[PDB]
Design an enzyme around this catalytic site. Structure first.
Site, PDB file in Angstrom:
ATOM      1  N   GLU A  46       0.776  -1.148   0.095  1.00 45.72           N
ATOM      2  CA  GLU A  46      -0.109   0.052  -0.049  1.00 45.72           C
ATOM      3  C   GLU A  46       0.896   1.216   0.006  1.00 45.72           C
ATOM      4  O   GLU A  46       1.839   1.389   0.753  1.00 45.72           O
ATOM      5  CB  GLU A  46      -0.906   0.056   1.287  1.00 45.72           C
ATOM      6  CG  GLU A  46      -0.276  -0.388   2.751  1.00 45.72           C
ATOM      7  CD  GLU A  46      -1.279  -0.617   3.573  1.00 45.72           C
ATOM      8  OE1 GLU A  46      -1.307  -2.209   3.447  1.00 45.72           O
ATOM      9  OE2 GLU A  46      -1.701  -0.293   4.339  1.00 45.72           O
ATOM     10  N   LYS A  47       0.511   2.325  -0.891  1.00 48.71           N
ATOM     11  CA  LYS A  47       1.072   3.415  -1.035  1.00 48.71           C
ATOM     12  C   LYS A  47       0.311   4.331  -0.096  1.00 48.71           C
ATOM     13  O   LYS A  47      -0.569   4.809   0.005  1.00 48.71           O
ATOM     14  CB  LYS A  47       1.213   3.851  -2.558  1.00 48.71           C
ATOM     15  CG  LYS A  47       1.624   3.000  -3.504  1.00 48.71           C
ATOM     16  CD  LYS A  47       2.818   2.118  -2.876  1.00 48.71           C
ATOM     17  CE  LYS A  47       3.066   0.663  -3.524  1.00 48.71           C
ATOM     18  NZ  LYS A  47       1.790  -0.078  -3.352  1.00 48.71           N
ATOM     19  N   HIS A  48       1.302   5.024   0.707  1.00 52.01           N
ATOM     20  CA  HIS A  48       0.968   6.261   1.494  1.00 52.01           C
ATOM     21  C   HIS A  48       1.090   7.566   1.088  1.00 52.01           C
ATOM     22  O   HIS A  48       0.634   8.440   1.573  1.00 52.01           O
ATOM     23  CB  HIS A  48       1.275   6.002   3.241  1.00 52.01           C
ATOM     24  CG  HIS A  48       0.787   4.811   3.621  1.00 52.01           C
ATOM     25  ND1 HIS A  48       1.353   3.539   3.748  1.00 52.01           N
ATOM     26  CD2 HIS A  48      -0.219   4.381   4.630  1.00 52.01           C
ATOM     27  CE1 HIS A  48       0.679   2.627   4.382  1.00 52.01           C
ATOM     28  NE2 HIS A  48      -0.225   3.172   4.904  1.00 52.01           N
ATOM     29  N   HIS A  59      -4.697   1.987  -0.913  1.00 49.63           N
ATOM     30  CA  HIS A  59      -4.681   1.868   0.504  1.00 49.63           C
ATOM     31  C   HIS A  59      -5.972   1.565   1.108  1.00 49.63           C
ATOM     32  O   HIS A  59      -6.849   1.725   0.203  1.00 49.63           O
ATOM     33  CB  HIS A  59      -4.511   3.148   1.290  1.00 49.63           C
ATOM     34  CG  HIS A  59      -4.116   2.970   2.689  1.00 49.63           C
ATOM     35  ND1 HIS A  59      -4.854   3.223   3.736  1.00 49.63           N
ATOM     36  CD2 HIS A  59      -2.724   2.515   3.097  1.00 49.63           C
ATOM     37  CE1 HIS A  59      -4.390   3.071   4.927  1.00 49.63           C
ATOM     38  NE2 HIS A  59      -2.912   2.470   4.764  1.00 49.63           N
ATOM     39  N   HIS A 113      -8.454   0.626   9.548  1.00 44.49           N
ATOM     40  CA  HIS A 113      -7.322   1.135   8.714  1.00 44.49           C
ATOM     41  C   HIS A 113      -7.550   1.904   7.342  1.00 44.49           C
ATOM     42  O   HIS A 113      -8.388   1.587   6.644  1.00 44.49           O
ATOM     43  CB  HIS A 113      -6.631  -0.264   8.537  1.00 44.49           C
ATOM     44  CG  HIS A 113      -5.511   0.219   7.762  1.00 44.49           C
ATOM     45  ND1 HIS A 113      -4.659  -1.165   7.331  1.00 44.49           N
ATOM     46  CD2 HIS A 113      -4.840   1.101   7.615  1.00 44.49           C
ATOM     47  CE1 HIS A 113      -3.387  -0.426   6.865  1.00 44.49           C
ATOM     48  NE2 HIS A 113      -3.372   0.764   6.892  1.00 44.49           N
ATOM     49  N   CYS A 165      -2.163   7.991   8.294  1.00 52.64           N
ATOM     50  CA  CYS A 165      -2.944   6.738   8.361  1.00 52.64           C
ATOM     51  C   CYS A 165      -2.578   6.375  10.073  1.00 52.64           C
ATOM     52  O   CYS A 165      -1.798   6.404  10.566  1.00 52.64           O
ATOM     53  CB  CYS A 165      -2.033   5.393   7.601  1.00 52.64           C
ATOM     54  SG  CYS A 165      -2.584   3.694   7.982  1.00 52.64           S
ATOM     55  N   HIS A 216      -0.089   3.591  10.074  1.00 48.53           N
ATOM     56  CA  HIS A 216       1.325   3.716   9.435  1.00 48.53           C
ATOM     57  C   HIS A 216       1.991   5.027   9.437  1.00 48.53           C
ATOM     58  O   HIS A 216       2.985   5.560   8.832  1.00 48.53           O
ATOM     59  CB  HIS A 216       0.832   3.103   8.269  1.00 48.53           C
ATOM     60  CG  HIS A 216       0.925   1.822   7.972  1.00 48.53           C
ATOM     61  ND1 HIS A 216       0.101   1.224   7.249  1.00 48.53           N
ATOM     62  CD2 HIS A 216       1.198   0.670   8.907  1.00 48.53           C
ATOM     63  CE1 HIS A 216      -0.114  -0.074   7.249  1.00 48.53           C
ATOM     64  NE2 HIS A 216       0.571  -0.531   8.277  1.00 48.53           N
TER      65      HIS A 216
HETATM   66 FE    FE Z   1      -1.576   2.291   6.055  1.00 47.13          FE
END
Ligand code: FE
Ligand code: FE
Ligand code: FE
Ligand code: FE
Lengths: 124, 124, 124, 124
Positions: free
Chosen positions: B23-25, B50, B56, B109, B112
């Site tokens: 997943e790209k944040h 994402h 989440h 996130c 994250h």
């Molecule tokens: Fe995430």
């Protein structure tokens, strides 16, 4: 006394105000009438023409949703805040809905208070 | 000890992370390279792919701006918050700039942390 | 170019600024050094003396937390926004922690940018 | 159809709800009945007992004010957001008032919607 919910300028008594001869505060909601479930779509919310300066701007927009059949309501969908002078009160969201209901837009002016807009959206 | 500004995942060390295999944040900033002064333009900010659920999601995006020649920096331009499950982390702002500088996007996130994106914009 | 995290006035280079002869922007964090796990405690965050008016105030305070041993960091704990002229930049939160780490306070001034404070808290 | 302001659980019909047998959502406002003008005082706002977890918490509290004699109303005073699981829905603000009116507290639950509390404050 008066309740909080009564303080909000509805789009019905939004036309018969003296300040709506100079500036519209009532949000404009652009969104499809019908969408497919779980499918993403755009909703645009904007206010204008209104000044945009430190002393006087639309500070923020709240996007809520009445979900038909949901036990309690509404669900808040998003909130955007604008920096006076830099950001226009104009925002596009992307949403996924599961069920039919009503989109509500709330704009806040630091001088002129809380203004409401309503738009029906069906999910088939 | 460690400073707050160091905690933020820059887009340089954003590629060499184990979670960027799933997943790209790092936010994607869409905005013109050059604009005219005082003239309104769109800036799109988005994160993905994402997950988007209660447990989440990208909770919010902050848009800041380094104004060249401004005594202090940065200026915060906008902030948008997304409801997990309903709103996609995808937003379009409208801006008016007076001077050249750098747009910064910060995504959050809940698992994250804080992720940064940067985009130069010239005002002629 | 410059990264977003570098833009933030740390409390080290917060003393050697020309504007800290007129107004302190660096947040003051009041919180116990040690707390028990899952037990609620107060954290006070305040900025001052600083002006508080439409043209110039602390707009908002963000409270974050570096959790020792957490895979990613930090966790944002809270965010408070103050109305210029009505609300002082002074707020008390109630928290429950599970693990040791560091509290971070970020204040935003519409003229003077982002200021950082740090406070260690142990959970036994 | 239904207006946004009607959706809000007032503290009158807050007692005759089935969910108020398990958890109170109606904010509690602690604030002096009378204050001096331009003089700073504390206002505490709290919700409970209510769960506090990712799947179910008081997400945020909004503090507004009806200023007697102000042309438009209300003025938003502050907004605080709480991280589920870490922050309790309990916050203390510091305010300066110039004129008499009514404090409003709005709590948001991600399952249970918008709840309202009201408290008169005189400025002498
Ligand atoms: Fe995430
Ligand atoms: Fe206005
Ligand atoms: Fe300042
Ligand atoms: Fe609830």
């Amino acid at each position: 006394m008066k309740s909080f919910g009564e303080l909000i300028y509805t789009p019905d008594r939004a036309e018969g105000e003296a300040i709506s001869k100079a500036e519209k505060h009532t949000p404009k909601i652009e969104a499809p009438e019908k969408v497919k479930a779980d499918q993403p779509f755009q909703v645009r919310v904007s206010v204008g023409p209104h000044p945009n300066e430190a002393a006087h701007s639309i500070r923020w927009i709240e996007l809520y949703f009445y979900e038909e059949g949901r036990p309690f309501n509404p669900v808040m969908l998003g909130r955007v805040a604008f920096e006076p002078g830099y950001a226009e009160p104009d925002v596009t969201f992307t949403l996924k809905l599961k069920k039919s209901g009503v989109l509500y837009a709330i704009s806040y002016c630091n001088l002129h208070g809380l203004w409401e807009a309503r738009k029906e959206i069906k999910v088939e």
